[PDB]
Every structure is written in structure tokens, then in C-alpha cells.
Amino acid sequence: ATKAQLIAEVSRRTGMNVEYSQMCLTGAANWNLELALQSFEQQKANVPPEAFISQP
Amino acid sequence: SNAATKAQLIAEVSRRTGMNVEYSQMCLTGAANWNLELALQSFEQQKANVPPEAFISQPQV
Amino acid sequence: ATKAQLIAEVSRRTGMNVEYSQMCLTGAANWNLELALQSFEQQKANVPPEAFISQPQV
Amino acid sequence: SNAATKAQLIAEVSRRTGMNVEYSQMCLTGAANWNLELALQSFEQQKANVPPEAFISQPQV
Amino acid sequence: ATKAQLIAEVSRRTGMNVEYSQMCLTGAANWNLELALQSFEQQKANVPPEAFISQPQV
Amino acid sequence: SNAATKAQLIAEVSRRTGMNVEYSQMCLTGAANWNLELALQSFEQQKANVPPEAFISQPQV
Amino acid sequence: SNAATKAQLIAEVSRRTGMNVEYSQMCLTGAANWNLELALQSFEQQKANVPPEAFISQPQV
Amino acid sequence: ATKAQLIAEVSRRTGMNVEYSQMCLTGAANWNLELALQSFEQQKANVPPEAFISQPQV
């Protein structure tokens, strides 16, 4: 459904796999796409290489 | 979760077809029941009829 | 039949909300009512309780 | 696609008038331009002319 | 049998097919030809290209 | 409805004969009982009695 | 390095919410950015959507 | 699973603090939970009492 679409969208924009993409969406972002992507952009330096599958 | 597993399939359909995530999910849900091959087959049959605005990249297939 | 009436009819017959009803119609069913309903009938055991209640507004 | 939004308007008209999906859409399409209030007004004025088979639930406008 | 005539006339004037022509007549227009055509002219930009089976005729 | 189905037949008679929708319906109603071929046959025999003002397009039976 | 520090925060969320380690980490990652107060705040607001199977101890936020 | 999750899970299961839980995961276990737990069970007698900040669960 929309959760799956939202994870897929975060994965597409950021290049992170779905596991890490889901991490940005869960919690205080509460599946808000803008807040999830923002959190990634702010924390991008701290994301391990294994979490990345593609370029943004 | 199952959402994450479903998300991997949506992302793959989007990569291969060039469609955005909404339309990629459309191909998977329903009679394809998340069968990747059957979803891609549905795109092949319907691609000429997919709205132009629905595409974020060129179809790769 | 319009896309909107097909979604509404699937919603009526199955009891699912419009979001999940649309899911059955798009894709391999390609807006065929019988194939959408068949797919529901096959998958009904695995359909989430959330699919049967209306989605929160706004 | 705006189909889901339209489907919600059809469903609302059906609940209120008791009409099936086809006839509920008739009241919305055209001069009402999918305005719920105008659709319901049209039903009230033309209420006498809707065939009995078109009714799947209780009229409650 | 003026309903069939009215649907046929809207199709001819607008170039739209019969199904969608009927949509313009039913509802708030109450089968008034002018009001149906007004509704078409106002919504024409939003009518899908698929509905048009011919060029509009004065 | 049945109005829409009748309308596609009126439209076809109009296209073929050049008559407006009113006179096109005349050929279909009655003994032709909406049989397209019988309607066109009636036009061919009776064309001489249709007023010229009734014609809005090219005759092309 | 930072994994052990994160682990004590997960352990603390689990203790208070009753959620397993997977779902406890969910509240911490993302917009909370491992802020314990914001993670717990998020749980309190979203408890209804947490699957029952995710709970391995008593809720005591 | 993340390294942090794996440490937290070993801690929950064994009762060891996070520092000693991490010890079981790093090295030849290469962050495999089952081997970490196997190593704990085999070496449990040698773990100092101060390392245990809770009772073991499943």
C-alpha cells in the first residue's frame, strides 16, 4: 500500500535500501515523506555504505 | 515488515519500467498478486497507454 | 464503465474501501470487474482488516 | 488519476439516495460537475424519474 | 424517445461519444440540451481525449 | 441504459443518410423496430418525402 | 563504535515501551535522531499502530 | 539487522551489558546472532558477575 510506496520512494530518491529507507519513515516522521527525506539529508554523513544500493 | 518486502518489488518495477512508485505498485497489486514477472508482463501489454506524466525515467525493458 | 464507477462497485460488493478496491482493478486485471472480484475472492483470507474500513480523512 | 476521489463521491451519493453506482454517478456528472450538494439537489428534483431497479438501499436524502 | 435523440445530438455537436454525451445530460442539466452543451464547453479541457470520436459540428 | 444504445443507432443512421437526429429516429422507430438495415432501407424508398431542411450532412447510404 | 551506545538506547526504549528490539529501534531512527525523549513521545502517539506481536514485555512508558 | 540491534538482542537474551554483548558478536561470529549466543552459552562460566545487568529471556 502507501507504506510500501513511501519506502520505495525514499529508496529511489536517497539510494538507500528499503531497510534503511523504512528507518527514516518510522518514528517521529510517522510516514511523512518530506520529514523522512529531510532526516536523511541531515544525517547522510552517518549512513553506512552497506545501506546504500544506488546513487540519489 | 511486509511493507519493506513489497517496497523492494515496487522499486524494481520502477527501475525496469521507468514508472513512478504509484504506477509501479499498480502493476503488482491485484491479479499479479506481487508476482514480479506477471507485473512486468502487465506493463509490457499496457505501456503505450500509461500516462506520460507517470514516467520518471525511460523504460529500460 | 468509468474507472470511478468500477472502483465504487468493487467497494460495494467486497466491502473494501476505495484504495484497496482500486488495487484489485489496476494492473493485470486492467479494470476488468470479474478478474478484480476473482482476485479478491482468491486473496480475501490475506487481506488486512484495514482494507475493510474507510481511510482517515484529510 | 482522480478516479478514487470520484469513487468516494459516488459512494456518498449512493449512501444518501439509495441509488446504485451507475445512477449515483449520473447525478454527479454533467452540470453538477461532481459537486456533492448539486448532485443531491438534482436527485431530489428528479427523484420521481429514477427506475426502481436502480435502488439498492434505503432512500434517506 | 427524446432521450435517445438528445444523447445523439450532444454527440454530434461536441464530437464526444454516446456514453459521455449521456453524462452531460443526466443530473443537474435534467436532459436540457443547452445546459448539457454548456457543461461540455466548460469541462472540455478536462474531458479525456478518449471520449472524442469526431470533430465538433456547429 | 437503453437510451444510449438507441442513440448509437440514431447516430449511425444520421451519419449514413445525412438526416438530423429527429428524422433519423423516425426511420428506426416503428416497423423497423430499431433494426439498422431495415431503417436504412426505409430511407432509401422514402427519401423523396424527407424535407430538405432535415439534412445536416452528406448523404452516403 | 557508536553501535554499543545506540544499543543502550534501544534497550532503554524496549524496557519502557515493551516493544522488541526491532520496533524499539524504529522509534529512535529517523527524525528523532536517537533522541530518547522524542522516540518515546513518538511511541505514545503511535502505540495503536504497533503490531501486538512486537511486544515482548510490559508497557510502562 | 543493524549492529546496534544485534547487540541489544544479545543483551536481552543473555542478560549481559552491551559491552560484553558486543564482544560475543565481534570477531569470528561476524555479527551472526546464533554464533554469538552459542559462544556465550559455551563461555558463560567465565563471564564476570558485574557484566550481568539482567536475567536471561527468550
Side-chain angles (χ1 to χ4, degrees), chain F:
Chain F
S1 61
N2 289 304
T5 305
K6 284 172 175 175
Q8 53 184 9
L9 290 162
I10 293 170
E12 183 65 8
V13 168
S14 177
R15 186 182 71 75
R16 288 287 289 283
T17 67
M19 291 184 299
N20 60 28
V21 299
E22 176 180 12
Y23 273 80
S24 292
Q25 186 175 57
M26 287 177 180
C27 289
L28 287 155
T29 54
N33 200 20
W34 295 90
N35 185 295
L36 182 65
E37 288 302 311
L38 288 178
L40 291 174
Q41 182 183 97
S42 301
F43 172 77
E44 290 172 17
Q45 296 173 273
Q46 302 172 39
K47 57 183 67 106
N49 302 290
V50 176
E53 61 266 19
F55 286 87
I56 59 179
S57 63
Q58 182 167 358
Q60 49 195 41
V61 177

Side-chain angles (χ1 to χ4, degrees), chain A residues 1-12 17-19 21-22 26 31 54, chain B residues 1-8 10-11 14 20-23 25-26 29 34 56:
Chain A
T2 62
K3 281 176 174 176
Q5 291 179 2
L6 288 162
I7 296 169
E9 182 66 5
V10 169
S11 176
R12 187 182 71 76
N17 62 30
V18 299
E19 293 299 337
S21 292
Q22 185 175 41
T26 54
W31 299 94
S54 180
Chain B
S1 61
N2 290 304
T5 306
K6 284 171 175 174
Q8 292 177 41
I10 294 170
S14 176
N20 61 29
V21 298
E22 174 179 11
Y23 271 77
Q25 185 174 57
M26 285 175 179
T29 57
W34 297 91
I56 57 181

Side-chain angles (χ1 to χ4, degrees), chain H residues 14-17 40 44 47-54 56:
Chain H
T14 67
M16 291 185 300
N17 61 31
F40 169 75
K44 179 177 178 341
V47 179
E50 62 266 18
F52 285 99
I53 60 181
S54 292

Side-chain angles (χ1 to χ4, degrees), chain D residues 19-40:
Chain D
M19 289 185 298
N20 62 27
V21 161
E22 173 179 11
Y23 274 80
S24 292
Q25 183 173 245
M26 285 176 179
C27 283
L28 288 155
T29 56
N33 203 10
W34 293 90
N35 182 287
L36 181 63
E37 170 173 11
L38 286 176
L40 293 175

